């Protein structure tokens, strides 16, 4: 009737590096 | 004081930073080349490369002030006539 399917391990997704990137704040206009 | 910003370049992790292709020379590169060529010429003549006092730069600046005194004497004796 219906063929069997086996519960394999899925292929790996391309990883999402969830880092918190930090930006240095700009300078302050001396005057 | 005023909280300035030093020169920074992080890593890229992106296919654009490998694409610059330009050779343009800064002030720091030409000053570093002046320093290296004044350390080599004080390293095959003075035979010490500590670069405390460089006498070759003293001699070359002496003859350059000679040529500059020539040029100022020319512009001083031209305006006389």
Swiss-Prot record, chain A:
Q: What happens when the gene is disrupted?
A: Deletion of the gene impairs iron-bound mycobactin utilization and EsxG and EsxH export.
Protein localization? Cell inner membrane
* Disulfide-linked positions: none
Highest taxon in the source lineage:
Bacteria
**Quaternary data:** Part of the ESX-3 / type VII secretion system (T7SS), which is composed of cytosolic and membrane components. The ESX-3 membrane complex is composed of EccB3, EccC3, EccD3 and EccE3.
User: What's this chain's function?
Assistant: Part of the ESX-3 specialized secretion system, which is required for siderophore-mediated iron acquisition and for the secretion of EsxH and EsxG.
Indicate what this protein is called per its UniProt record. ESX-3 secretion system protein EccC3
Organism encoding this protein: Mycolicibacterium smegmatis (strain ATCC 700084 / mc(2)155)
Taxonomically, what lineage is the organism? Bacteria, Bacillati, Actinomycetota, Actinomycetes, Mycobacteriales
> Which span of the parent protein is shown here?
2 to 32 of 1325
From Swiss-Prot, chain B:
Which chain regions cross the lipid bilayer? 63-81
Q: Name the species this protein comes from.
A: Mycolicibacterium smegmatis (strain ATCC 700084 / mc(2)155) (Mycobacterium smegmatis)
Name of the protein in question: ESX-3 secretion system ATPase EccB3
Q: Subunit details for this protein? A: Part of the ESX-3 / type VII secretion system (T7SS), which is composed of cytosolic and membrane components. The ESX-3 membrane complex is composed of EccB3, EccC3, EccD3 and EccE3.
Q: Which family does it belong to?
A: Belongs to the EccB family.
**Gene (name only):** eccB3
Protein location: Cell inner membrane
Annotated region Disordered: where? 1-18
- Shown portion of the whole protein? 9 to 89 of 518
What is this protein's function? An ATPase. Part of the ESX-3 specialized secretion system, which is required for siderophore-mediated iron acquisition and for the secretion of EsxH and EsxG.
Leader sequence residues: none
Domain of life here? Bacteria
């Amino acid at each position: 009737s219906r063929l069997i399917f086996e519960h394999q391990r899925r292929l790996t997704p391309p990883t999402t590096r969830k880092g918190t990137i930090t930006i240095e704040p700009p300078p302050q206009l001396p005057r | 004081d005023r909280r300035s910003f030093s020169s920074r370049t992080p890593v890229n992790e992106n296919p654009d930073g490998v694409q610059y292709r330009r050779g343009f020379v800064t002030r720091h590169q030409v000053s570093g080349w002046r320093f290296v060529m004044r350390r080599i010429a004080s390293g095959v003549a003075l035979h010490d490369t500590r670069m405390l006092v460089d006498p070759l730069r003293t001699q070359s600046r002496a003859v350059l002030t000679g040529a500059l005194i020539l040029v100022t004497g020319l512009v001083g004796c031209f305006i006389f006539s």
